[PDB]
Amino acid sequence: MVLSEGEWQLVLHVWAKVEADVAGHGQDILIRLFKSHPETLEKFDRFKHLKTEAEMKASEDLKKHGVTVLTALGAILKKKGHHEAELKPLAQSHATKHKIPIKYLEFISEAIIHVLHSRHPGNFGADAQGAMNKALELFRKDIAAKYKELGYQG
Numbered sequence: 001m002v003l004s005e006g007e008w009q010l011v012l013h014v015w016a017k018v019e020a021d022v023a024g025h026g027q028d029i030l031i032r033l034f035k036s037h038p039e040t041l042e043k044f045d046r047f048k049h050l051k052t053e054a055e056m057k058a059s060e061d062l063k064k065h066g067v068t069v070l071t072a073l074g075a076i077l078k079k080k081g082h083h084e085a086e087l088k089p090l091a092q093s094h095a096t097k098h099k100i101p102i103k104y105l106e107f108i109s110e111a112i113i114h115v116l117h118s119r120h121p122g123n124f125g126a127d128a129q130g131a132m133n134k135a136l137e138l139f140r141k142d143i144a145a146k147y148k149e150l151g152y153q154g
Ligand code: HEM
Pocket: 040, 041, 043, 044, 045, 046, 068, 069, 070, 072, 073, 089, 090, 093, 094, 098, 100, 104, 105, 108
């Protein structure tokens, strides 16, 4: 699939707001993912012991990881589709080391959309959400294809 420049503009415009508070957005997103789909927490041996949302909010470690996730995703989005180099090491670690099924990438995509909708209503109308969903679908499709080449296609 291919996004138009207009679609990328909508995506990068709301992402510029996200970048005003990367740690806060990273936290909200990972917590939303863990509350909505608790099974995903089992993949993080580093966080698997967090029992409540209160514990999650208090975790400095979870917060640092959220920053790592959003910084990596932001670097990919800013490439506007030319992200093959950035995708390679990410696909390799998630397919071979962490073993993250595509289904879980759909779950985090949903969490990202939920949080942007909640925090940025004025910059995340229907068209902007459609563009963000298209950018994340492209990301998932490309990661899925890499998974297959790497022998996982999980
Ligand atoms: C927007 C999608 C995601 C991005 C951009 C992303 C990015 C990253 C980055 C950059 C790292 C550190 C380097 C590495 O190991 O590759 C990482 C580690 C990891 N990721 Fe992801 N990730 C994503 C989704 C997921 C999902 C949905 C899961 C699990 C349900 C997951 C589980 C893990 C685990 C288990 C680690 C290692 C954490 C640790 O022990 O330090 N990732 N991810």
